[PDB]
Amino acid sequence: LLHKRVVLASASPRRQEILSNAGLRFEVVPSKFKEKLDKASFATPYGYAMETAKQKALEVANRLYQKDLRAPDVVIGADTIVTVGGLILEKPVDKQDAYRMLSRLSGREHSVFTGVAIVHCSSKDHQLDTRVSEFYEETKVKFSELSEELLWEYVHSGEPMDKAGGYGIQALGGMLVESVHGDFLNVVGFPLNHFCKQLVKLYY
């Protein structure tokens, strides 16, 4: 990917930070894909997460190409969801949504899935040809038993707001999270090691 034009189709500071720290050079072009798919339409939550990442990356790829007639080399999409007792949780709409999510998660183990779509693009015959490679990573996370007081403490901080399931493992989310099991970068927002393995598959 060194001398290729790479587009990260995500406004997430946490995803950007992970890719930058890994040494990747990329431009940030957030997706306008605002349709959210029917969760019931997918056999698995990770199927849902991948398709969502694919659609965001394809939206960006086509939009860029339509704009200046330049096929971006690679467009990366990602979508992180939480599942607990069979329900998919995404980002909280407001603080009250956040509290409900965290109550649900309290004292339980849940899964975090990040679906990733790597889209290779080229232009031929006045159209964008896209080749999509799709993968996901699952990490299990355990919450300790949260009190009404801690719950509202964390909600009022605002930390829940930009995060799947309304929490993070990194800061004052540390008071909520008892343990993580698998790839921790996947929980932050991007499964870096899996991505790197995917690039090896695609280029070798």
Side-chain angles (χ1 to χ4, degrees):
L1 292 189
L2 168 66
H3 292 124
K4 299 199 175 192
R5 178 186 174 204
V6 187
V7 175
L8 178 59
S10 171
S12 165
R14 294 177 306 156
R15 295 194 171 106
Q16 295 167 24
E17 288 167 353
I18 293 173
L19 290 169
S20 298
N21 288 347
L24 186 79
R25 297 290 172 99
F26 56 87
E27 77 194 63
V28 172
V29 185
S31 184
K32 287 187 180 185
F33 187 74
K34 70 200 267 165
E35 190 202 332
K36 288 239 176 177
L37 312 159
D38 189 348
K39 304 187 271 195
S41 271
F42 296 89
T44 67
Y46 55 91
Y48 168 79
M50 290 186 287
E51 186 62 20
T52 300
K54 171 178 177 185
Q55 292 312 320
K56 299 185 196 176
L58 286 182
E59 185 280 314
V60 167
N62 293 287
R63 174 160 46 97
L64 293 171
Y65 172 79
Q66 290 296 324
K67 181 175 172 156
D68 61 7
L69 298 182
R70 216 153 54 103
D73 296 318
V74 178
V75 184
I76 303 158
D79 187 60
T80 305
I81 57 169
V82 162
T83 67
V84 63
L87 176 63
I88 290 164
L89 306 179
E90 307 172 302
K91 299 188 287 277
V93 297
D94 44 44
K95 258 108 163 190
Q96 301 66 47
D97 199 13
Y99 170 92
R100 295 194 290 277
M101 278 182 193
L102 298 158
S103 304
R104 196 100 66 178
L105 295 175
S106 170
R108 298 181 76 164
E109 191 182 71
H110 66 269
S111 297
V112 179
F113 292 94
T114 302
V116 181
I118 307 180
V119 186
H120 282 87
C121 317
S122 51
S123 156
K124 91 194 291 161
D125 284 303
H126 314 289
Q127 64 215 182
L128 188 65
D129 285 347
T130 51
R131 316 182 325 164
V132 183
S133 182
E134 281 171 278
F135 73 93
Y136 73 98
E137 187 71 18
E138 182 185 1
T139 302
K140 281 155 194 298
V141 178
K142 179 84 193 297
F143 267 31
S144 47
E145 269 155 36
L146 314 182
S147 61
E148 192 67 352
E149 176 161 7
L150 180 51
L151 275 160
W152 278 107
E153 254 278 317
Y154 189 69
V155 171
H156 288 133
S157 78
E159 274 212 25
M161 282 318 115
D162 51 7
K163 292 171 185 67
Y167 77 93
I169 63 155
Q170 281 188 298
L172 95 300
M175 290 176 88
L176 276 65
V177 175
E178 201 173 79
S179 64
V180 177
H181 295 277
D183 184 38
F184 74 87
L185 286 184
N186 183 46
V187 182
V188 180
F190 199 81
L192 178 68
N193 289 155
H194 196 151
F195 176 74
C196 290
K197 290 202 268 223
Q198 200 79 355
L199 294 179
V200 174
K201 281 190 255 179
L202 297 165
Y203 283 87
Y204 305 96

